[PDB]
Amino acid sequence: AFELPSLPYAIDALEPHISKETLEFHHGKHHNTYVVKLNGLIPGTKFENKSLEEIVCSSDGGVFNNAAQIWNHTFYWNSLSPNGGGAPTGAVADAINAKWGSFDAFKEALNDKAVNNFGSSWTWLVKLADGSLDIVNTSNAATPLTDDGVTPILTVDLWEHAYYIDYRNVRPDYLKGFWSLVNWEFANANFA
């Protein structure tokens, strides 16, 4: 059966951007629930002995919602670090300048995509077939993991549980937090 991965850092490590309480609900409860629900839908079925990724790339309805959500959250914990934040570095820093002209223009373009991402959703930094970086929004459990030629680089969870405890309704406050946490090492790893 699938397991809930351990968080890549201590539960208070993202303070004060993301609270210890948010992490216990978000990772300990929400992410956990997608794991048990998936574990509850696959016994006996054809997805029974497939990896998480084979499942999200070949499933539907409830099996897809849960498997994609487990995958999205794991990627999300990885896009954050108590050692991240600030200016981008390496390959991704230059790729960002190539597409948007400057990091600041990129921040503004992602923030705009994120605040207007209606309902439960995800905003992704992705690498396209032509080697270039782009920003795409998915809704509910959808993920670019399933689009040919699109490689997920970083993600920001915009479902309301991702920030309500800490920022209530103001997404820009949450996004300011994200930027202080962005894991550029994870980004560069996915990009290369």
Ligand X SMILES: OC[C@H]1O[C@H](O[C@H]2O[C@H](CO)[C@@H](O)[C@H](O)[C@H]2O)[C@H](O)[C@@H](O)[C@@H]1O
Name the residues that contact a copy of itself, by CB under 8 A.
Answer: 25, 29-30, 33, 65, 118-120, 139-141, 159-161, 164-165, 168-169
Site membership for ligand X, residue 51 (CB under 6 A): no
Site string (94-133) toward ligand X, x via CB under 6 A? ----------------------xxxx-x------------
Q: Does 157 bind Fe ion (CB under 5 A)?
A: yes
166 scored as a contact of Fe ion (CB under 5 A): no
- Compute the least distance from the CB of residue 85 to a copy of itself, in Å: 26
- Footprint on residues 54-83 left by ligand X (CB under 6 A): 61-62, 65
Question: Given the complex with a copy of itself, which of 26 and 127 has the nearer CB atom?
Answer: 26
Fill in the amino acid letter for 182: V
* 94 vs 37: CA distance, rounded Å: 41
Q: Which residues bind ligand X (CB under 6 A)?
A: 61-62, 65, 116-119, 121, 137, 139
Q: Which residues bind Fe ion (CB under 5 A)?
A: 157, 159, 162
